[PDB]
Write the structure tokens for this entry.
Amino acid sequence: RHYEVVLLVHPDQSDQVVGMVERYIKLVQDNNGIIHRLEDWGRRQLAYPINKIHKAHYVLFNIETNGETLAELEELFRYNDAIIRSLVMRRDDAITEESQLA
Amino acid sequence: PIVKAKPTSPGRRFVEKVVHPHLYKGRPFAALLESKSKTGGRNNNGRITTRHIGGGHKQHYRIIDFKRTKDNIPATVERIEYDPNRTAHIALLKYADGERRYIIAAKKQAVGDTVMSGEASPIRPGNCLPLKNIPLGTVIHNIELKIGKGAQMARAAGASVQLLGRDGIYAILRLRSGETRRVHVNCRAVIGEVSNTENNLKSLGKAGASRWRGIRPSVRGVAMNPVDHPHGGGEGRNKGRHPTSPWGQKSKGLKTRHNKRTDSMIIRRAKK
Amino acid sequence: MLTNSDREQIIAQYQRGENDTGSPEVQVALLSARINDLQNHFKAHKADHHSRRGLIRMVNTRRKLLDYLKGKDLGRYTTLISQLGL
Amino acid sequence: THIDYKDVELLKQYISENGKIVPSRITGTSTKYQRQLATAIKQARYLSLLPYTDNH
RNA sequence: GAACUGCAUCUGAUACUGUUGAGCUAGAGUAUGUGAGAGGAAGGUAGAAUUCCAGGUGUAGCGGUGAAAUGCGUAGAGAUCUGGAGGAAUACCGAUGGCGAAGGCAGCCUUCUGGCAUAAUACUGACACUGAGGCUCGAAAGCGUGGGUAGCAAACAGGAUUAGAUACCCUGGUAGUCCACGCCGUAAACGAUGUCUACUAGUCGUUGGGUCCGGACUUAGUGACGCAGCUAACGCAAUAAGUA
RNA sequence: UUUAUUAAAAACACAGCACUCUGCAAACACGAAAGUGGACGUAUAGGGUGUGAUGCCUGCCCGGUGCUGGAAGGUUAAUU
């Protein structure tokens, strides 16, 4: 099952935004999952403030995994507390083309 | 769950018993047991200081680990036992070194799963963590009040606490009393609500069942003579006076808390 | 659900002829597999009446095909229900 | 051809000045693509790529 | 005499019905690919807004009405700014639009899951329709138990209006509305139109497909008209209330 | 269950219901205090009060007296 997950991380943790990305990569790939796309939209300006901040780091990684690793990933996103938003969508196929936001 | 008895006797017509097939049918772990004689509600003067206590079944004390200081050594849940000393179920923990303890069992805690104590523990039911390491909004139980003393709050069956937030070295907890209060962030808590959530759905059925639990009958003040109780007296039924205890303290609405040294720990209470 | 692979496994097991996939045997076997698999869904979702409507229709269709097959050839019907535990 | 929620620059000309979705009787879009556009706009609003209203 | 439409038993016929053997694919289904959808169930989450709590600014009104008054406010309201709590609903999109057997179903995401629509090929070979009883589901209100409780609001309290006003209007306000699990089994539960077939001028929209050359044809819906026909009339008219 | 020894009951208790208190060194109770009971319990717990299985239910009144909250103003102790 292919999933497209967009993470929305605090600007105060943009330095560790890379480390958490590789941690999630390792978790996905250690469960025989595939990581098809990994972009980094950088410090985007929010259209409305989230938790009092106006700028935040966007990272979209189109991964391919199973339900159990998806649950593990979702719990990690819930408990990270550096991620202020997460959008996990399901895709019928795998997307590798460069997105319009990068 | 709750099982009604058939009305095959008038003393059975309203018995609704709490039934748990999944809890141990055998005897408790003998090394964690202490003798405990009944008190009759009498203090060291031999005086009744707490009324309606007496009789009931002999029961041992199960030594409960309320402190959970075997940190970083995993334990497996050997069994879930009935405890006559509380309304919650207890879990026999078997540590990696082989030491066995009893803890309060969480609702989502089954035989076989692994529990952890310390600060680097997963947020799973039965794990004991300092309140600074528990994410906000997690449902917790067995709250420590003084650092290192052991759990005192949210221990009864079904007991849960909302971990609302933080201000400095304090965690803000909403208790099931409708009370929001501060607790030091170094105090510990256990993840999840407490087992035996349907404890309060039970119906004893008959007077003898209350006697089995060591409770003596209760005689209303209005049924006495005035020499026994402020409500005593009267030709026929009559109250006459504002409701009050036998010692003359009013019992409808009058507040009785008097503790200034802890008054700063309490954010607020709820109104309903 | 049932995957394409296990659906084809059931089809192959109950083929009366080559790649028929339409006889009462294969139809009843596929319906039986789908019902036994949907039991898992309806044990966790008891109030799913809109899905239960379709499952009941599956049961009705299997009953119609079993009665038709019994009236057609009784040996085939008694063999099929013995294989499927019905 | 196709429409996604990461086409924010495309979604801008289908959102109003105050963040409201513009109706089909104005834009002229088909029912199917209008449904997809509404879904993508709602997703972008969640991801804070577009504003819900113009006064948050 | 005729009749006694009747019954019985033999004989003959096989068009139809009944019972049977074999075969067929056009009704009904299966496998395979795509597609649309507020279909259902369980979780999570977002943003606007209300209410409340606590502060800053500030001062004499606010609120409400046809006018008023009750109410709130000098113990500092209302307004404005900043924080916090909580519940409920999901603006725009939005559409005689869609999905569902009806009842119904709208933020977004995931998980489980039903039906439908569509192309071609292969397959089964009448497996069909309807259906007394029976069962299932079934708005809202209501009921039981346990939660929750912002807004709204039966009851209720007050203020008006009035001859009166157990109302309409105003200020409040509890059940209920929300959740879980069970009842209840009723609605102008309506298209006041049972289900399923086939056939019968046409014209213009629209939703989901398909095939051709921006159009044309065809499909399953969903609408507006309009012949024949039908109707007491109104009207219905391929989504019949026509012909069976 | 009860008036041992003139009253056994419709009285008391009772399972159940409700209100209210109590965040733990709990409230509450014994005690001069230490020390205790509550309880090696922890708000699904513990105390007080009323009512008394269950079924259907439980209307109106906050003027009085209590209780809860509030503090603008009036009055007000020792002290100075």
Observations:
- The two ends of chain A are 25 Å apart (CA to CA).
- The helical segments of chain A are 17-29, 67-80.
- Chain A is about 25% helix and 40% strand.
